[PDB]
């Protein structure tokens, strides 16, 4: 029933608009999109760039997570997500998700949940580079 239009892991730029368009469904009345972007600051330090690496399994794991969230949903027509990896500039999208639902609540809930599921359970890591020359591995500080 609930459809997965994307669950992509990629080194190419990613776009909310493309995911909105993907999940459009005739029966949907609500679409909710998420974009995770690299902030300019983190813990007071100005950021220079982020590098995302992925476990060789992450592509399959992503696909499985989006499938899982979709299957367990209700009120939801379609979902789509992409996670970008490699070198990202300040201000670029790392993660994009969109959910089409008949009504608002499902869409807001399912998108928030899809985003949370990926952050928690996808084996990718981010290396944060700062302008003061330092660099930090998130979650292993």
């Amino acid at each position: 029933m609930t459809q997965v239009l994307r669950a992509a892991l990629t080194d190419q730029p990613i776009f909310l608009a493309e995911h909105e368009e993907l999940v459009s469904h005739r029966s949907a009345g609500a679409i909710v999109g998420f974009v995770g972007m690299i902030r300019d600051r983190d813990g007071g330090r100005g950021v220079l760039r982020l590098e995302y690496s992925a476990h060789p399994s992450a592509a399959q794991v992503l696909a499985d997570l989006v499938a899982e969230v979709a299957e367990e949903s209700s009120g939801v027509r379609a979902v789509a997500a992409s996670h970008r990896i490699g070198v990202l500039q300040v201000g670029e999208a790392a993660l994009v998700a969109a959910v089409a639902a008949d009504h608002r609540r499902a869409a807001f809930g399912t998108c928030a949940h899809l985003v949370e599921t990926i952050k928690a359970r996808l084996p990718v890591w981010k290396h944060q580079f700062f302008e003061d020359g330092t660099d930090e591995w998130v979650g292993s500080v």
Partner: protein, 84 residues
Amino acid sequence: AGIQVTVRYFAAARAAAGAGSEKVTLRSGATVAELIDGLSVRDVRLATVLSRCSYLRDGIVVRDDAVALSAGDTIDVLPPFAGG
């Protein structure tokens, strides 16, 4: 005797170790715990990262570290995930 296993390192653990992988020689029947303990003693920083890692063995998450290794095993070292 001895057996050789490959350790593959990721993210912060690859930084601290100084390599993407390492062939480690251990006593035959060495546990996953004997392996990590061995890596830990050797470098302080790596140990700090290692103490929040999960591990995969030939791709399957290691539930219990008292499990014995087999020659040719690959152990993946997974820091905590930081997606998004």
